Structure formats: structure tokens, C-alpha cells
Design a protein around this ligand. Structure first.
Ligand SMILES: NC(=O)C1=CN([C@@H]2O[C@H](COP(=O)(O)OP(=O)(O)OC[C@H]3O[C@@H](n4cnc5c(N)ncnc54)[C@H](O)[C@@H]3O)[C@@H](O)[C@H]2O)C=CC1
Ligand SMILES: NC(=O)C1=CN([C@@H]2O[C@H](COP(=O)(O)OP(=O)(O)OC[C@H]3O[C@@H](n4cnc5c(N)ncnc54)[C@H](O)[C@@H]3O)[C@@H](O)[C@H]2O)C=CC1
Lengths: 203, 206
């Protein structure tokens, strides 16, 4: 389901962060503190990799990071479009890290004539939203990013579904209802998680 | 407010569970339903939730809204939080105009940018962008508790060091760097959300 995918990505991000610190062996307790999770749950998940995932008395950071990365398919590239050339849409098209990880934005769209024709990023010009459905099907786009206001999120999501999209990354504060998977971005949820750790420490 | 870790761990679990119940339109929940979604004994739920008396009960079950307000109150997170945004670019402007923040009690009382051509602009209705030199003074004078880092990766660790010396209580970071500060830091990374998305896409194809 959704939680096991989030944990697997959590493990991957944490192990990558552990490798940058020079750590080669990590314990389930240390992973518990970094991911805010039970240690027994971590040992239950990582037993999938057997002895290959172990080193010393803890876990082989390098082996787990490599195996999970192959499970997550980090080598594959993905074609993305962004609907909405506002503040969020411009930030996504200018996000240097996304292009490095294989998430290629080949098109960005908007409904405002003042933004159409201009450049959202180097090599990417804003296209009319009326051409979004043909653009998705012509380039075989897999992922669409919804960066339009709330009241147009569901409509854009449905046109992506009709055009053959495979998944949606949604910024708009609406519950998108489609038959493709959806990942919602909610910085308010990240803020709430931050407030919990603030009151625990500051008290 | 001395709350033990085993008790505090369940309150946040209740809190997160009750939050989804409100977004599901649920007004009344039973101890057995809470047991089903929390993987805790129903005898434990009724033991914990009796702390709120009749105020937490509604009909034959529990008042989801009253319990959500009271548990967030005990955890100390229901209060309004004063926020500042460092960086008035694309991310900073979108954060400054985000409606859902104000509804959940995250009020941005100031935004900062080191660009002289940007200083003085509006960015969002009801607020003015300021010079980053006065970030320490603004955080100290207004008691800002959460700082949002929307600066490029090059100046990100320095911004987090200034907020720590100014007395910030937390940091929301967008920049793609490892923030090395003693204050708690929460990082936003849509590539992680994309990795979750692509993994689910591939599994459905298989
Ligand atoms: N998930 C989160 O944490 C946050 C959510 N948001 C949401 O992201 C979305 C956009 O945010 P901003 O960039 O700050 O606002 P914005 O106004 O700068 O961007 C909106 C863009 O979408 C275009 N647009 C409007 N209707 C359209 C349609 N049917 N089709 C194509 N394009 C259309 C507009 O021309 C405009 O350029 C909003 O829904 C906002 O609530 C904003 C900040 C963070
Ligand atoms: N976590 C995620 O998923 C994503 C992260 N980002 C990151 O957010 C940050 C901002 O991105 P954008 O706003 O889209 O680009 P941007 O170029 O529009 O934002 C830069 C702004 O920060 C200002 N600035 C530069 N140095 C500063 C300093 N020392 N102090 C205060 N302000 C300073 C600049 O004057 C400019 O206004 C970047 O680090 C970016 O990598 C961007 C997209 C999504």
C-alpha cells in the first residue's frame, strides 16, 4: 500500500544521507531515531534482504542503499509535464535536483495568455493548456504535476487521466480523485510534523 | 506539562488518526473503530479517552472534533505559530500566498530576501519583503518560532545558523542541502514524493 512505499523511500533517503556522513554500519535503533519509527518495525522490514543487508552488528548501509535503489528503479528516467506556470510551476521547472534524479520536465502549461509563449526555465517555454492532452499522448508523458489553483485541480487531473498519464504529483489543496496514483504535496503537514518536535524539545 | 513518552506517543497517534477522521467527514467514532485504525486495544483507547470526560463523547461514541481540539491542546500544537520566510522567490511567494497555512494556524508575519531590487515589494497581500540583515532583529523582536528557508542551496546553511542564533524554535527547509543545526529541521523534497509516485506506477504495471 501507500505506507510501505513511503517507508521504502524513507529508508532510501535516510541511507543516502547516512552514506554522505561516511557511515557504513547503522543499527535499527539509530534508523529508528532518524525516521521516527519503531526499531522492531525496521528489523521486520529489512529482514527482506537477509544477511546481504547486514554488516557487523548493524546494517550494511551501502548494500541496502544499492538494493533499495534498484527496487525503486532509480536508474529509469521519467517524462513530466507541469500544469500551472505560477510560483510553484516555475520552482519545479527550475529545480536542478529533479533533472539529476531522472525526472525530466519536457513541457509546462498554463491558461493565462500573458504567461504562454514565455520561458518558464532554460529550454522550456510555457505552452497553452489547450494542447496539454495532445502533448501528453504525443510524447508518452508518464507523470503530470498539478500547480494550478484549487478549483481547477480536479479538471486538470481528469484531462491528464484521459490523455494517458500514469501518475500525478498534486500541489493543489484538493483531494484529487482519479484512477492513477497520486502523491500530494502539503507543506502544512510538514509544518505540523515540525511543531511536534518543537514542543517535545522546547517543552 | 510532563507527559511520558509512551503516553505522548499515543496522543500524536490519536491526533493523526482523528485528523483523517475529520477529513473523512466522520463526526462520531467508536473505541473499536479507533482500535481498528490504530492497532491498539479498545480497552486502551477508552482508558486514554476517558481523560476528556463527557466533552470527548458524542452519542454512543466519541466526539472526533472535540478530541482533536483537546489532544492538540495538550500536545501544545493547536496554538498559532509565527513564521518568517527567508527567500522571496518562487517558493517563497507560493508559501506566502498559501491559504491552507492560515487555516491550520501557521501565520507568516514577515518575509526576507537579500535582493535589493526585491526589497520593498509586496509578494503577498498584507506583508512586505524585508532585508535579511534585520532577520535576527525581527525574529527576536516578534518571537518568531518557525523559519522557512527558500534560499538557494549556497546560502541555506548560513540562513539556518542565523535563525538558530536569533532564537528560532524550528526550521522548514526547501533547499537541497544537509542542514547542520541543533534546532529541529523539517525538509521538503518533492523528489521523494516522485519516488513514492513512480514506485506505485511501476508496481501497477507489473
Ligand atoms: N502543497 C503545498 O504545500 C502548497 C500548495 N500551493 C498550491 O499550488 C497551486 C499554485 O500555487 P502558486 O504557484 O503559488 O499560485 P499561482 O497563481 O502563482 O499559479 C497558478 C498558475 O496556474 C494557471 N492556471 C490557472 N488555471 C489554470 C488552468 N485551468 N489550467 C492551466 N493553468 C491554470 C494560472 O494561469 C497561474 O499561472 C495552488 O493550488 C496553491 O494552493 C501553493 C503553495 C504550497
Ligand atoms: N524541496 C523541493 O522539493 C524543492 C526545493 N527547491 C529549492 O527552494 C529554493 C528556492 O527555489 P526557487 O524559489 O524556485 O528559486 P528562486 O531563484 O526564485 O529563489 C531564490 C531567492 O532567494 C534570494 N536569495 C538568494 N540568496 C539569499 C540569501 N542569503 N538570503 C535571502 N535570500 C536570498 C534570492 O534573491 C531569490 O529571491 C532552492 O534552493 C530550490 O532548490 C525548489 C523546488 C522544489
Amino acid at each position: 500500500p501507500k505506507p510501505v512505499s513511503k517507508r521504502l523511500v524513507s529508508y532510501y533517503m535516510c541511507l543516502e544521507r547516512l552514506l554522505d556522513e561516511g557511515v557504513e554500519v547503522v543499527s535499527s535503533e539509530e534508523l529508528a531515531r532518524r525516521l521516527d519509527l519503531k526499531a522492531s518495525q525496521i528489523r521486520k522490514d529489512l529482514s527482506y534482504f537477509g544477511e546481504f543487508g547486514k554488516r557487523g552488528v548493524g546494517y550494511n548501509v551501502e548494500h541496502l542503499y544499492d538494493a533499495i535503489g534498484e527496487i525503486l528503479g532509480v536508474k529509469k528516467e521519467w517524462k513530466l509535464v507541469v500544469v500551472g506556470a505560477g510560483n510553484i510551476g516555475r520552482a519545479v521547472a527550475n529545480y536542478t535536483v529533479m533533472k539529476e534524479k531522472g525526472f525530466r520536465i519536457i513541457g509546462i502549461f498554463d491558461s493565462d495568455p500573458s504567461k504562454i509563449g514565455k520561458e518558464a526555465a532554460p529550454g522550456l517555454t510555457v505552452s497553452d493548456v489547450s494542447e496539454l492532452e495532445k502533448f501528453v499522448e504525443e510524447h508518452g508523458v508518464e507523470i503530470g504535476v498539478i500547480a494550478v489553483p484549487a478549483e481547477h485541480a480536479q479538471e486538470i487531473a481528469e484531462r491528464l487521466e484521459k490523455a494517458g498519464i500514469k501518475g500525478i504529483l498534486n500541489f493543489a489543496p484538493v483531494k484529487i480523485k482519479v484512477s492513477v496514483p497520486v502523491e500530494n504535496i502539503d507543506i502544512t503537514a510538514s509544518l505540523r510534523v515540525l511543531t511536534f518536535e518543537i514542543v517535545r524539545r522546547n517543552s
